[PDB]
Amino acid sequence: AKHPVPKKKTSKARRDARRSHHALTPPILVPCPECKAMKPPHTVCPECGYYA
Amino acid sequence: MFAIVKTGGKQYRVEPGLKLRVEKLDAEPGATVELPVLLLGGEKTVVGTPVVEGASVVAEVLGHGRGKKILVSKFKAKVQYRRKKGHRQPYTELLIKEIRG
Amino acid sequence: KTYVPKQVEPRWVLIDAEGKTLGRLATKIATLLRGKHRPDWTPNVAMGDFVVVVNADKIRVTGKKLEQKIYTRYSGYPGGLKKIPLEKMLATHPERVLEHAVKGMLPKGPLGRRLFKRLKVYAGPDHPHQAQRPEKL
Amino acid sequence: PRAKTGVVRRRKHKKILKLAKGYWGLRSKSFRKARETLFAAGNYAYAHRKRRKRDFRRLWIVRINAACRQHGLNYSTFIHGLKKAGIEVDRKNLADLAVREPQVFAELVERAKAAQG
Amino acid sequence: MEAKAIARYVRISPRKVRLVVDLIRGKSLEEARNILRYTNKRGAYFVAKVLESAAANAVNNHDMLEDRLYVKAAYVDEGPALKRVLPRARGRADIIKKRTSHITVILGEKHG
RNA sequence: UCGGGGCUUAAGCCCAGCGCCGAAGCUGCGGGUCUGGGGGAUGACCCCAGGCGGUAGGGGAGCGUUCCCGAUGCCGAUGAAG
RNA sequence: GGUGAAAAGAACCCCGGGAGGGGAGUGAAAUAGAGCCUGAAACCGUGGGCUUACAAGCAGUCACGGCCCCGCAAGGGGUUGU
Structural contact between residues E76 and E18, judged by C-beta atoms closer than 8 angstroms: yes
CB neighbours (10 Å) of residue B40?
A: 26
Taking Cα atoms as reference points, which of B39, B36, B11, B48 lies closest to residue D87?
B48
Tell me if E54 sits within 8 A of E6, measured CB to CB: no
Between A and E, how many residue pairs show a Cβ–Cβ distance under 8 A?
Answer: 22
DSSP state of E28: B
Instruction: Give the C-alpha separation, C34 to A34, whole Å.
Output: 72
Experimental determination technique = X-ray
C2, D69: Cβ pair inside 8 Å? Answer: no
Strands C51-53 and C70-74: unpaired
Q: Residue B72 phi/psi, 5° resolution? A: -85, 110
E95 burial type by CB count under 10 A (0-12 exposed, 13-18 middle, 19+ buried): exposed
| Residue in C35, C37, C43 nearest the CB of D59 | C43
Asked if E102 has any chain A CB less than 8 Å from its own CB, the reply is no
CB distance A38–E37 less than 8 Å? yes
Question: Do residue D99 and residue C2 have CB atoms under 8 angstroms apart?
Answer: no
Question: D81 vs chain C: nearest CA distance in angstroms?
Answer: 20
According to DSSP, the residues that pair with E28 across neighbouring strands are E70
Q: Which nucleotides of chain G does any protein CB come within 7 A of? A: 13-16, 18-23, 40-47, 54-56, 58-65, 74, 76, 78-82
CA B56 to chain centre: 15
Determine which helix (DSSP H) or strand (DSSP E) holds D110, and give its type and residue range.
helix D103-116
Q: Is the dihedral of CA C39, C40, C44, C50 positive or negative?
A: negative
Please state whether beta strands C51-53 and C13-15 pair in parallel, antiparallel, or not at all (unpaired).
parallel
Report the greatest alpha carbon distance in chain E: 67
Q: State the DSSP H helix or E strand holding residue D107, giving kind and residue range, or none if neither.
A: helix D103-116
B73 CB contact with strand F at below 7 Å: no
Separation in Å: F75 C1' and B87 CA: 36
Type of residue numbered C38: R
Whether the bond into C128 is cis, omega within 30 of 0? no
> Which pairs with CB-CB distance under 8 Å and at least 24 residues apart come from D82-88?
D82/D108, D82/D111, D82/D112, D84/D112, D84/D115, D84/D116, D85/B48, D85/D111, D85/D112, D85/D115, D85/D116, D86/B48, D86/B49, D86/B50, D87/B39, D87/B46, D87/B47, D87/B48, D87/B50, D87/D111, D88/B50
Best mutation target among B6, B7, B52, B73 (most D Cβ atoms within 10 Å) is B73
Spatial distance from the CA of E2 to the C1' of G10 (Å) = 24
Q: Which residues of D touch B53 (CB under 8 A)?
A: none
Mutation site for E-interface testing, chosen from A12, A16, A18, A24 by largest number of E Cβ within 10 Å: A24
Count of alpha carbons within 13 Å of E60, Cβ hemisphere only? 8
Strands (E), E1-112: 2-10, 69-86, 94-109
Contact criterion met (CB below 8 Å) for D89 and B39: yes
If DSSP states are collapsed to H, E and C, what string results for D45-77?
Answer: HHHHHHHHHHHHHHHHHHHHHHHHHCCCCCHHH
The torsion of the CA quartet C74, C75, C81, C84, rounded to 10 degrees, works out to -70
Cβ of D94 within 8 Å of Cβ of B75? The answer is no
CB E104 within 8 A of CB E4: yes
**Under a CB-based contact definition with an 8 Å cutoff, are residues E10 and E101 in contact?**
yes
Q: Which residues of D touch B72 (CB under 8 A)?
A: 42, 45-46
Whole-number Å distance between alpha carbons of D14 and D30 = 10
Long-range residue pairs from C64-73, CB within 8 A, at least 24 positions apart, any chain = C65/C22, C66/C90, C71/C97, C71/C100
